[PDB]
């Protein structure tokens, strides 16, 4: 159940001693290393042509946050505050009140994307699939406060990315 690495004794006949001296004087394993590097010279490299080629992803990928709507335009979020209760970074801040038709909705839904650890506990705690961590990873900003999303930015992320978010949830919800 165990094996000894590096517990070989070299032979001491004239054959193997001359083999080790030929390896010393003729640099044979160094030529072996040159041969391996020369072998990789004549391979196709693994390099994709970004931005024109993209690395392969899965439908479970956890990128930029978005707030989804029902297929009637009504937003799914009903202010239950499970997502800021489970948020390990406390990146989510929610404030709510009943709006003009009596619906339980949020007035504040903020996600500090610089606090966020992108672990997706908010999408798996959400009982109505409102907050999702969608596919977008190319949302780098030139300013720190541009990574402090309010509810309007997250609803625009949902309206921007719903055509892809709904297909990823369709491909993945049976594992959940």
């Amino acid at each position: 159940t165990y094996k000894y690495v590096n517990l070989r004794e070299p032979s001491m006949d004239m054959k193997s001693v001359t083999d080790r001296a030929a390896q010393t004087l003729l640099w044979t394993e160094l030529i072996r290393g040159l041969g391996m590097t020369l072998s990789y010279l004549f391979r196709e490299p693994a390099t994709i042509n970004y931005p024109f080629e993209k690395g392969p992803l899965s439908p479970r990928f956890r990128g930029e946050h978005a707030l989804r709507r029902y297929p009637s335009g009504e937003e799914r979020c009903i202010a239950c505050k499970l997502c800021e209760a489970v948020c390990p970074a406390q990146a989510i801040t929610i404030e709510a009140e009943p709006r003009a038709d009596g619906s339980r909705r949020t007035t504040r839904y903020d996600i500090d994307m610089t606090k966020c650890i992108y672990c997706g506990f908010c999408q798996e705690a959400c009982p109505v699939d409102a907050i999702v961590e969608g596919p977008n990873f190319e949302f780098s900003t030139e300013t720190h406060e541009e990574l402090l999303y309010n509810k309007e930015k997250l609803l625009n992320n949902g309206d921007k990315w719903e055509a892809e978010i709904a297909a990823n949830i369709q491909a993945d919800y049976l594992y959940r």
Partner: peptide
């Protein structure tokens, strides 16, 4: 002083490369 904010935990290497191109 910071020029480019690349978000993620960690941001993917493709996302860091997007930030470098920006």
């Amino acid at each position: 002083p910071v020029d480019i904010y690349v978000p993620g935990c960690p941001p993917t290497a493709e996302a860091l490369l997007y930030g470098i191109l920006q």
